[PDB]
Structure formats: structure tokens, C-alpha cells
Amino acid sequence: SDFVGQTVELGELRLRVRRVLAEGGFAFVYEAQDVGSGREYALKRLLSNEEEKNRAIIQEVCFMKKLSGHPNIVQFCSAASIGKEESDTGQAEFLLLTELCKGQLVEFLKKMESRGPLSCDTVLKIFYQTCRAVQHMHRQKPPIIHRDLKVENLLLSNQGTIKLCDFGSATTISHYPDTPEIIDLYSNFPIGEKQDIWALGCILYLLCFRQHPFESIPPHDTQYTVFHSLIRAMLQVNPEERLSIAEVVHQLQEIAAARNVNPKSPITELLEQNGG
Amino acid sequence: QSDFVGQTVELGELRLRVRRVLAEGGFAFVYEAQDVGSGREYALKRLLSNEEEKNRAIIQEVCFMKKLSGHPNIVQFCSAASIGKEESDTGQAEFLLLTELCKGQLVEFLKKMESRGPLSCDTVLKIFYQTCRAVQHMHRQKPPIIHRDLKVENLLLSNQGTIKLCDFGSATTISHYPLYSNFPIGEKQDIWALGCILYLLCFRQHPFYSIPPHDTQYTVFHSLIRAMLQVNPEERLSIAEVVHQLQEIAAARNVNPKSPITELLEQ
């Protein structure tokens, strides 16, 4: 692989591939710059030799496009595909172009470790903005379930706000039509939301206490008390007793209003630091 | 455990007497049901769930059944309904899927025919064509619906003596589909599974291969078997090509391959 250095055409864009930003399973992510305009992007390149992988990749692209437009989701810019024979890999090649963020949230959190625990207001804004993204997913008809919510996948935008970008594990119901009860487009069964709520509860716990919860709230904590009932309500062992994302977001708004915080605003205490 | 036989279940205007069990398994049981007000008979599938992942898979199955209904080789969807965990007698979410009642499972009828010797090429042709036509309807959707569990044991025979597909519990597709229609997304594995069915109908064993060296009866099918069972998925025929070849075979045998499979229907 030396995709770095190449130029890639996507519609009217001519993108110089500047460097690698991230790698792993299906895919690598690069920094790219459009020659005509100077605009900068993240370019994800996913390779497939197999029809099951084709389906998963195309599904990811559809979710990115569907969810784009929310302020806490990365913006979808464009996508393209190269057939196996016409590609330089001898594989199907998929190119997904999105907004370039400042970097991964955890890189900015590392910088704070030497200084001290995060303020409750910083936690509040990170977690609110994350939960707002998840809300936008769960409110779709039918709901889109993320299934892989983790702190290490969250991005910080250039404006200092959280962005979700990893829809490779997401799922929903296809061909949803937009005494027992006849099934209506007005259905009220959970279809995966509750596991996203649990995963978010783990994020909250980790943001406050800086340890992973499964290996209870630390008995001597008095700094993050404001979040204790939410943590307990999201980490209920029985999925059906967990809050919905609407209730989670409502509670975080109440908390923000009571703390004089606009929870949508830039997380400036991270944005003073370096992570990408 | 079927306390359910003998109950009456209301689904809108239907009042369905649950007459007996037809089929069972992990997810679900299937019952014969009869509407009191009309005398109409149905298959009633009852799917129980204690978890959200299963709720999703169930509702997905219902959505596929409803989307595919209307094709002559797909069981007809009639209605669906749910009972919440608390209001249900199981202490679980209960889903009820009501469809057309078929005559029975295809393999039951094939068993009866064993006594009479190998199936004629015409019978194989009609069974296989009608199966492939159902799969074609799936693969032609935009985006394609992939079945993923095609097997001879799951095929039904209708009351008119035609093949019906009914098991969409393993199916998948792409949601929120908008540059992409050239990529296979699972069709080739359905093709392989269908090739196994054709082989099994002719030679009465599952290929897993090799076409039996001494066969001269089913020669007309040999290349289609080989073309569907290619080791490399991308070298396998599409379902459109498969159907085209079966139609040519039919026309050369003077057979309307959509018509009732009468030789099964007298069993």
C-alpha cells in the first residue's frame, strides 16, 4: 500500500491523498485535499473481495448518507466505487469522502490526564453531544441502531463539538412500511436501542471515573454526583428497565439548564489542546 | 409445549381457531388456523421473543413476507399482529404472522414419490423453475433481497400444486438505498444453494462434488448444475440466466414450467 501521494478523482473533485489518519479491519482513512478548491476531507477506502463485504460496505455508506446533516454526525460529502478489474488492488474498492475533523476525542482527553479529572461541564457537553447523535439515529422510522458505540470512535470537529462517524456495525429494519394488536408503522418494540443505551452508560462512566465499569459507582466520588442517577438508570441489567435515549437527552438538558450550560456549545477546554 | 392448539385468536375481523401444529423449531411454531366467520384456512406462525435482537429479526421477517407477497411462488401474506410481554400468556413478546395455508412441505410429497422411482425430468423442471422464479423476484428487488437459507426442506407445495417459498427469517438486503447496482451482495450464495437443490432433486443426495458418471436421465440439467455450483462465486450464473435457461429447456420439452405439478398433487 502507497495510496498516500496519489490523486483520486471523485466527480468534479481531484483529491491529493496527503497521509493516513486511521486504519484497522475493512478500511483505512486518509487526509485528502481537493486541488481545485483547497478544501480538506477525510477519505475512507474500503476494499472487498467478497459479496458479504460488498453488502456491509454499501450499507455503511447508505447509513452515513442518511444520517449526514445532524450537527453531531460527520458530514457525508461523496462516495464512489472502483470495480475489481479496473482497480489497482484486484478488489472492489469503495471510497467514502466526509468532513475532516480535528481528531479523535480520546487523543484530546489524554492531554488532560496530567492536569486532572474532567470538569462536570466538559463531561456534560461531550456526553450530551454524543447522545444527541444517537437520538437522531434512534428517532428514524424505523430506528437505526448503532451497535458499536465506544469512546475511541468519537471525533472532535474543528468547531470543538462531538461527531459520530462509525456506522459499519449499524442496523435497522428494511421494507418497513414507512386480543393481539395488528402490526402498524406505529410499533413499540425495542429492536436494539437498549444495547446502545448500555454502551452510552459505559461511556459516561468512563468519562467521569476514567476506568472501565465492567472487569458500581466509586463509593467515595463526590465530583460527578450530578451524573450518578443517569449512570445507574442507563446501566440497568435488565434492558427493558433502561431509559430511552429521549429520556437520557431530556435529563441531560435539565442538568445543563440547572448548571447554566448550553450543552451544544464548543467544548473549549479540549479545543485548547492537540490530538490530530 | 403447545397449549396454543384449541385456542381462538382474534386478528382484526378474523377469529381464528388454532386447529393443530404443522411445524416447529427454535424461533417459532406454525399452526393450521381456520377463520370462524368465513371458513377460510391459514397458516399461523407464532414467534416468541424475550430480547430486542430477536424482536428485530422477527419484525424484519414480517416485513420481507409482506414485501414479497403477491408473487405466484411466494406464500401469500395475510396479516400480522403482536402481543406485548405483560399482556401475553407466555411472559414474552408474541408475534403472530398469518399467511396462506399450503398443502404441505415439498419433501413430504417427494418421499411418497420415491416408491415410483426417480422423478421425471419434467417434474424436476417444474419444481426447480418455480423455486428459481421466487428467488428471481427476490433478487430483482431494488435493492436485491438475498434469501440465505435456500433448502429443499423449506419449500412448500400449494393447494394448486405449485412451489411456494415461505422462510424469510434469514433474509437480508440493504436499507436506505439511494452507482452500486453492479456489485453482488449475496446473490451468488443463493445461486449455489439453488444448484444444490437441483442436484438433490435429480440425484436424491446433497452434492457435498460430482455429477454421477453413469447418469443419462438428467443430462439436460448437467451444465446448469455445473454452472451454478462453480467454486468461484463470480463465475456462477445470475438468477436471470438460470431462469432463461430453464425456460429454453421447458420450451424444448413442450412444458409450461409455471403449471401445476400434477404428479406430486395426486399424493
B161 neighbors B265 (Cβ within 8 angstroms): yes
- Which residues in chain B are contacts of A240 at CB distance < 8 A? 85
CATH code that applies to domain B8-103 = 3.30.200.20
CA separation for the pair A95, A89 (Å, rounded): 13
Contacts of A96 (CB under 8 A, 6+ apart): A43, A44, A45, A46, A60, A61, A64, A76, A79
- Which residues in chain A are contacts of B84 at CB distance < 8 A? 181
Q: What burial letters (b/e) apply to A177-190, b meaning 16+ CB within 10 Å?
A: eeebeebeeebebb
Say if B200 is an interface residue toward chain A (CB within 8 Å).
no
B64 neighbors B71 (Cβ within 8 angstroms): no
Kindly report the nearest CA distance between residue A191 and chain B, in angstroms.
5
Check CB contact under 8 Å for B180 and A51.
no
B3 is a catalytic site residue: no
Q: If contacts are CB pairs under 8 Å, which of residues 176-195 in chain A contact chain B?
A: 176-177, 179-183, 187, 189-195
B172 neighbors B204 (Cβ within 8 angstroms): no
H or E stretch including B36?
none
Experimental method: X-ray
Say if B208 is an interface residue toward chain A (CB within 8 Å).
no
**Domain chopping of chain B, boundaries:** 8-103, 104-267
Q: Write out the three cell numbers for B186.
A: 449475496
> Burial level of A78, CB count in 10 A (0-12/13-18/19+)?
middle
Q: Write out the three cell numbers for B126.
A: 417444474
CA angle B186, B191, B192 (to 5 degrees): 100
Out of A2, A88, A121, A148, the active site residue is A148
Phi, psi of A162 (to 5 degrees): -80, 140
Point out the residue among B9, B93, B179 whose CB comes nearest to the CB of A81.
B179
Q: If contacts are CB pairs under 8 Å, which of residues 131-150 in chain A contact chain B?
A: 145
A192 neighbors A145 (Cβ within 8 angstroms): yes
Check CB contact under 8 Å for A58 and B188.
no
Out of B35, B149, B167, B215, the active site residue is B149
- Which residues in chain B are contacts of A176 at CB distance < 8 A? 63
Q: Rounded to whole angstroms, what are the CA distances from A153 to A73, A201, B248?
A: 12, 15, 54
Q: How far apart, in Å, do the first and last CA atoms of chain A sit?
A: 22
CA angle A163, A157, A134 (to 5 degrees): 10
**Paired residues of B146 in beta bridges:** B172
CA separation for the pair B63, A183 (Å, rounded): 10
Q: If contacts are CB pairs under 8 Å, which of residues 216-235 in chain B contact chain A?
A: 233
Unique residue bearing C-alpha cell 431494488: B142
Q: Which of the residues A53, A84, A173 would you substitute to probe the B interface, choosing the one with the greatest number of B C-beta atoms within 10 Å?
A: A173
CA angle B45, B48, B50 (to 5 degrees): 165
CA angle B181, B193, B267 (to 5 degrees): 125
Kindly report the nearest CA distance between residue B80 and chain A, in angstroms.
6
Cα-only R_g, chain B: 20
Topology, domain B104-267: Transferase(Phosphotransferase); domain 1 (1.10.510)
Q: Write out the three cell numbers for A216.
A: 458500581
CA angle A66, A71, A76 (to 5 degrees): 40
Name the class of domain A103-276: mainly alpha
Pick from B218, B220, B223: which is nearest to B203 by CA? Answer: B218
Pick from B267, B243, B211: which is nearest to B125 by CA? Answer: B243
Resolution in A: 2.1
Kindly report the nearest CA distance between residue B238 and chain A, in angstroms.
13
**Residue count of chain B:** 267
Name the class of domain A7-102: alpha beta
Point out the residue among B10, B59, B180 whose CB comes nearest to the CB of A81.
B180
Pick from A50, A79, A55: which is nearest to A66 by CA? Answer: A79
A183: nearest CA in chain B?
A: B81
A122 neighbors A267 (Cβ within 8 angstroms): yes
CA separation for the pair A159, B58 (Å, rounded): 42
CA separation for the pair B261, B266 (Å, rounded): 9
